[PDB]
């Protein structure tokens, strides 16, 4: 039940959840953060849910290097590079890239489970995005005690309000 | 003229307001780079874009929303993610002419792809019709754009919307 589309998005996805996993697993080096291991350990299961998808769809798998900051796409090639080093300047900065990550993923997350009728992906789909939900109530909840807060970039402002104020999922 | 008055939800009206700010944004950067480089490709897709700007106005007039274009100058935004948005890109286009021409290229990347987001996000058959219709106008200036890309030994690859949507629209002609 397969599209060309549906594969693409797939693809990315597969390598999304990859920069998120690879980004906190440099920051909570930096800055030592207990929340960055937490959601890697996490965002390394959302890479795997894929890799599932893909062994069972016959697609060929692009981390042919599992290595942090690896990327088949220059687009995560690229978005690495500037998120760490920006990450790299403060706590609320790398804080900041979190949220920044769920943020651009949730909305990521979104525009392809509409692509899709393959009710497998739209389930897996469905279900790392519940998975970024949570990581975001977590960036911005450490945010707000640090002083500071997240405007939201990609998703509305809307259902980012929707979700830190609705509570655990 | 689409009537009568259907249901409007908050983030529907959200839209609304974002695309609105949106096609300004295209609008101000073409006229700006028009004034730099003097490409007629500017000056006509700024008048599309006016167009389109007008379009939406005619939904928030429709539905009751006050405007954010409070100040219509150039450059000018509500929304800082605008500002922000406008200054980074006539930055980069003020370069080259090959530049203007990526930057180009990549509002109307964006622009497809809020479209789709926002599409997406709604059933009030009236907006579900304007968006439709401005994603039309603007595959046309992903089109435009890279023809001229082509005519400077240049490409584009996509940034917001699919590969393979992208393909799709340039492997066919103007609607």
Redesign the interface.
């Known amino acids: 039940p397969i599209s060309?589309?549906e594969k693409?998005?797939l693809i990315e996805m597969r390598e999304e959840e990859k920069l998120a996993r690879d980004v906190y697993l440099t920051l909570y080096n930096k800055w030592k953060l207990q929340i960055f291991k937490n959601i890697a350990e996490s965002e390394q299961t959302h890479m795997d849910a894929v890799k599932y998808l893909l062994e069972k769809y016959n697609i060929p798998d692009p981390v042919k290097n599992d290595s942090i900051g690896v990327f088949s796409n220059p687009?995560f090639e690229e978005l690495y590079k500037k998120l760490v080093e920006k990450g790299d300047k403060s706590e609320v900065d790398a804080l900041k890239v979190g949220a920044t990550i769920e943020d651009l993923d949730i909305?990521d997350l979104?525009?392809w489970i509409?692509?899709t009728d393959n009710e497998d992906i739209k389930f897996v789909y469905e279900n790392l995005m519940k998975g970024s939900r949570n990581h975001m109530r977590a960036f911005v909840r450490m945010l707000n005690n640090y002083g500071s807060n997240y405007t939201p970039?990609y998703i509305?402002?809307?259902?980012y309000e929707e979700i830190i104020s609705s509570s655990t999922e």
């Open positions: 060309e589309e693409e998005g687009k909305a979104e525009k509409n692509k970039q509305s402002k809307e259902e």
